[PDB]
Tab-separated table of C-alpha atoms in Angstrom:
chain	number	residue	atom	x	y	z
P	1	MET	CA	-32.332	-129.268	-143.639
P	2	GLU	CA	-36.100	-128.679	-144.300
P	3	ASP	CA	-39.664	-128.361	-142.705
P	4	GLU	CA	-42.724	-130.654	-143.264
P	5	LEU	CA	-44.353	-127.479	-145.096
P	6	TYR	CA	-41.137	-126.886	-147.079
P	7	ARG	CA	-41.085	-130.405	-148.504
P	8	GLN	CA	-44.734	-130.694	-149.781
P	9	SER	CA	-44.077	-127.179	-151.499
P	10	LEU	CA	-40.906	-128.272	-152.731
P	11	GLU	CA	-42.414	-131.566	-154.288
P	12	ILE	CA	-45.428	-129.618	-156.065
P	13	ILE	CA	-42.873	-126.761	-157.283
P	14	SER	CA	-40.505	-129.575	-158.298
P	15	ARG	CA	-43.014	-131.735	-160.349
P	16	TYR	CA	-44.433	-128.638	-162.219
P	17	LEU	CA	-40.438	-127.277	-163.166
P	18	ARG	CA	-39.900	-131.007	-164.344
P	19	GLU	CA	-43.125	-131.255	-166.174
P	20	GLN	CA	-42.284	-128.094	-167.920
P	21	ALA	CA	-38.875	-128.960	-168.654
P	22	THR	CA	-39.885	-132.144	-170.235
P	23	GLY	CA	-42.985	-130.828	-172.247
P	24	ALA	CA	-45.109	-133.607	-170.730
P	25	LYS	CA	-47.070	-134.232	-167.388
P	26	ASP	CA	-45.261	-136.273	-164.802
P	27	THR	CA	-46.425	-139.472	-162.852
P	28	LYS	CA	-45.248	-139.134	-159.232
P	29	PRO	CA	-47.819	-138.751	-156.391
P	30	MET	CA	-48.494	-135.887	-154.539
P	31	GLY	CA	-46.258	-134.415	-151.394
P	32	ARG	CA	-47.692	-134.898	-147.785
P	33	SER	CA	-51.206	-133.208	-148.595
P	34	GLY	CA	-52.986	-135.750	-150.895
P	35	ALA	CA	-55.834	-133.243	-152.177
P	36	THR	CA	-54.018	-129.735	-151.274
P	37	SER	CA	-51.032	-130.700	-153.044
P	38	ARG	CA	-53.231	-132.019	-156.185
P	39	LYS	CA	-55.381	-129.168	-156.186
P	40	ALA	CA	-52.173	-126.730	-156.094
P	41	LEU	CA	-50.421	-128.585	-158.834
P	42	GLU	CA	-53.332	-128.270	-161.376
P	43	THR	CA	-53.962	-124.619	-160.384
P	44	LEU	CA	-50.420	-123.849	-160.998
P	45	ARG	CA	-50.063	-125.476	-164.156
P	46	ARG	CA	-53.046	-124.175	-165.725
P	47	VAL	CA	-52.586	-120.512	-164.749
P	48	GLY	CA	-48.913	-120.712	-164.974
P	49	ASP	CA	-49.043	-121.559	-168.427
P	50	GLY	CA	-51.014	-118.403	-169.070
P	51	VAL	CA	-48.554	-116.174	-167.170
P	52	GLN	CA	-45.605	-117.677	-169.268
P	53	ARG	CA	-47.638	-116.841	-172.543
P	54	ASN	CA	-47.795	-113.088	-171.595
P	55	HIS	CA	-44.527	-112.798	-169.877
P	56	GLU	CA	-42.458	-114.973	-172.222
P	57	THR	CA	-41.642	-111.923	-174.131
P	58	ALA	CA	-40.282	-110.100	-170.874
P	59	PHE	CA	-38.603	-113.154	-169.437
P	60	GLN	CA	-36.753	-113.933	-172.202
P	61	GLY	CA	-35.160	-110.119	-171.896
P	62	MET	CA	-33.518	-111.162	-168.861
P	63	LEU	CA	-33.156	-114.797	-169.483
P	64	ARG	CA	-30.611	-114.218	-172.498
P	65	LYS	CA	-28.255	-112.344	-170.211
P	66	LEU	CA	-28.803	-114.502	-167.389
P	67	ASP	CA	-28.604	-118.105	-169.209
P	68	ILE	CA	-27.968	-120.483	-165.958
P	69	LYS	CA	-24.542	-122.606	-166.676
P	70	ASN	CA	-24.190	-123.732	-162.862
P	71	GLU	CA	-25.808	-123.479	-159.401
P	72	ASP	CA	-24.176	-120.231	-158.605
P	73	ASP	CA	-26.293	-118.538	-161.171
P	74	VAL	CA	-29.336	-120.244	-159.433
P	75	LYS	CA	-27.918	-118.582	-156.380
P	76	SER	CA	-28.260	-115.261	-158.285
P	77	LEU	CA	-31.767	-115.825	-159.321
P	78	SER	CA	-32.665	-115.924	-155.531
P	79	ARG	CA	-32.110	-112.343	-155.405
P	80	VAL	CA	-34.550	-111.581	-158.230
P	81	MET	CA	-36.980	-114.001	-156.569
P	82	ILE	CA	-36.958	-112.142	-153.504
P	83	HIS	CA	-37.780	-108.822	-155.582
P	84	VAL	CA	-40.676	-110.667	-157.156
P	85	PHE	CA	-42.406	-110.165	-153.837
P	86	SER	CA	-41.179	-106.558	-153.150
P	87	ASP	CA	-44.279	-104.924	-154.347
P	88	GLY	CA	-45.548	-104.702	-150.657
P	89	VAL	CA	-49.161	-105.952	-151.765
P	90	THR	CA	-50.464	-109.302	-151.423
P	91	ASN	CA	-51.591	-110.763	-154.797
P	92	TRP	CA	-51.126	-114.573	-154.821
P	93	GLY	CA	-50.703	-114.215	-158.502
P	94	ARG	CA	-46.847	-113.352	-157.691
P	95	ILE	CA	-46.840	-116.511	-156.126
P	96	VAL	CA	-47.538	-118.167	-159.344
P	97	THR	CA	-45.302	-115.831	-161.246
P	98	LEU	CA	-42.544	-116.820	-158.971
P	99	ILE	CA	-43.067	-120.672	-159.577
P	100	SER	CA	-44.170	-120.016	-163.454
P	101	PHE	CA	-40.733	-117.820	-164.034
P	102	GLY	CA	-38.833	-120.930	-162.113
P	103	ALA	CA	-40.531	-123.365	-164.583
P	104	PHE	CA	-39.700	-120.730	-167.792
P	105	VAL	CA	-35.993	-121.231	-166.725
P	106	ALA	CA	-36.311	-124.630	-165.872
P	107	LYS	CA	-37.325	-125.611	-169.470
P	108	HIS	CA	-34.289	-123.518	-170.962
P	109	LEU	CA	-32.133	-125.673	-168.329
P	110	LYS	CA	-33.142	-129.093	-169.868
P	111	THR	CA	-32.770	-127.376	-173.387
P	112	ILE	CA	-29.306	-126.813	-172.470
P	113	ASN	CA	-28.781	-130.125	-170.764
P	114	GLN	CA	-28.605	-128.520	-167.278
P	115	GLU	CA	-31.685	-130.266	-165.676
P	116	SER	CA	-29.134	-131.136	-162.482
P	117	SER	CA	-29.636	-127.385	-162.105
P	118	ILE	CA	-33.618	-127.491	-162.217
P	119	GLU	CA	-34.169	-129.461	-158.904
P	120	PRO	CA	-32.055	-126.938	-156.762
P	121	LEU	CA	-33.796	-123.800	-158.760
P	122	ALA	CA	-37.213	-125.050	-157.344
P	123	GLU	CA	-35.549	-125.617	-153.803
P	124	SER	CA	-34.566	-121.609	-154.597
P	125	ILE	CA	-38.091	-121.061	-155.498
P	126	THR	CA	-39.443	-122.707	-152.438
P	127	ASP	CA	-36.645	-121.333	-150.390
P	128	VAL	CA	-37.666	-117.692	-150.967
P	129	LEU	CA	-41.378	-118.510	-150.515
P	130	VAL	CA	-40.581	-120.109	-147.219
P	131	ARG	CA	-38.012	-117.542	-146.249
P	132	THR	CA	-40.537	-114.238	-146.690
P	133	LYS	CA	-43.910	-115.750	-147.191
P	134	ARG	CA	-43.631	-118.303	-144.375
P	135	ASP	CA	-46.349	-117.225	-142.173
P	136	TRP	CA	-48.986	-116.290	-145.058
P	137	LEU	CA	-48.580	-120.194	-146.275
P	138	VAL	CA	-49.726	-121.418	-143.001
P	139	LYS	CA	-52.132	-118.479	-142.013
P	140	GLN	CA	-53.878	-118.492	-145.358
P	141	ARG	CA	-53.424	-121.927	-146.044
P	142	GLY	CA	-51.245	-120.721	-148.972
P	143	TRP	CA	-51.816	-123.676	-151.088
P	144	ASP	CA	-55.568	-124.218	-150.042
P	145	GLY	CA	-56.052	-120.413	-150.033
P	146	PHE	CA	-54.120	-120.615	-153.812
P	147	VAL	CA	-57.007	-122.746	-155.267
P	148	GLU	CA	-60.086	-120.635	-153.689
P	149	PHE	CA	-58.396	-117.214	-154.675
P	150	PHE	CA	-57.999	-118.265	-158.281
P	151	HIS	CA	-61.406	-120.375	-157.920
P	152	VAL	CA	-60.476	-123.711	-159.093
P	153	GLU	CA	-62.513	-125.875	-156.758
P	154	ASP	CA	-63.792	-122.655	-154.919
P	155	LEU	CA	-67.620	-121.743	-154.733
P	156	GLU	CA	-67.367	-118.780	-153.169
P	157	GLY	CA	-64.932	-116.160	-154.502
P	158	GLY	CA	-61.566	-116.319	-152.340
P	159	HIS	CA	-61.153	-112.521	-153.124
P	160	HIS	CA	-61.679	-110.703	-149.424
P	161	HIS	CA	-58.935	-108.147	-149.567
P	162	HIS	CA	-59.228	-105.867	-146.574
P	163	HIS	CA	-56.302	-103.172	-145.439
P	164	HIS	CA	-55.708	-101.868	-141.933
């Protein structure tokens, strides 16, 4: 029921959530795009951790009244995930914030034994991503554009904001 682009992104996000949940690094290969998914994953984990550090005090504020006890709560998280992009602006950092918050909830899920909820949660992250940022993903090469924007394997700058 997915797209090729959906499966690749789903795999990347799925791994990061499982790694954060298990408190360790995973062993699986990267989905579809060997290099793109690799560079995307390592960038996601390094910057996502930082986002969690500064945002943790904020996320816990909602997480306490959320507490996912079944997939239906994840379906509710989807509504929040949509609002995470409702800023109107671009900011690839929000893409990171989406996946980072997903991992932040995922680690809580494994803590409460709800690991089965983590995977459909990762699908929810990818679902909203592909639902609203579909065109941006392919047009700006999403993951390839993500790594240059945050300047990991980049040597130019990535930043080139133009409004019209």
